[PDB]
Ligand binder design. Sequence first.
Ligand SMILES: COC[C@H]1CN([C@@H](C)c2ccccn2)C(=O)[C@@H]2CCC[C@H]1N2S(=O)(=O)c1ccc2ncsc2c1
Length: 128
Amino acid sequence: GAPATVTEQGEDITSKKDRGVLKIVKRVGNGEETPMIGDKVYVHYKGKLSNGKKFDSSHDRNEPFVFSLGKGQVIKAWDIGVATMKKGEICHLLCKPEYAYGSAGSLPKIPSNATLFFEIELLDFKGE
Ligand SMILES: COC[C@H]1CN([C@@H](C)c2ccccn2)C(=O)[C@@H]2CCC[C@H]1N2S(=O)(=O)c1ccc2ncsc2c1
C-alpha cells in the first residue's frame, strides 16, 4: 500500500542522506515557490502507524493544522518535508523515529521507536 510504496520508492529529502525522511509527491502543486522559514503554513494531514492504525487526521476536525515553519513547532520530519512543498501539493512522507518521536514516543498514541506515515496537503503559506 502507500506506506510500502514511499518506503521503497520515495526520495530521501534529508540533508544527511540517511533516508530518515522519504517523500513522494502525489498531487503536483502550483508553480515553483515553497514556503520560507518562519512562514505561517496551513496543512491538512492524516497520520498512520506502522501497525496500520490511523492515529490522527486534521480532516476529521474540519480545520487545518497551522504552524510556523522551521521553528521546531513540529517533529523534524515535518519541518523538513513541508519546506519542500508547493502550494496545493499533496505528498506522502515516511518519518523514521529519529525525525519524529524517537525512543520516547508520545503518550498515548505514538509508541517508542515508531516510523510514521503521513499524507500532507499544503493549503497555503504566508509571511507574517
Ligand atoms: C494534533 O497534533 C498536532 C501535531 C502534534 N505534533 C506536535 C506539535 C506535538 C505537540 C505535543 C505533543 C506531541 N506532538 C507534531 O509535531 C506532529 C506533526 C504535526 C501534526 C501533529 N503531529 S502528529 O504526529 O500528527 C500527532 C502526534 C501525536 C498525537 N497525539 C494525539 S493526536 C497526535 C498527532
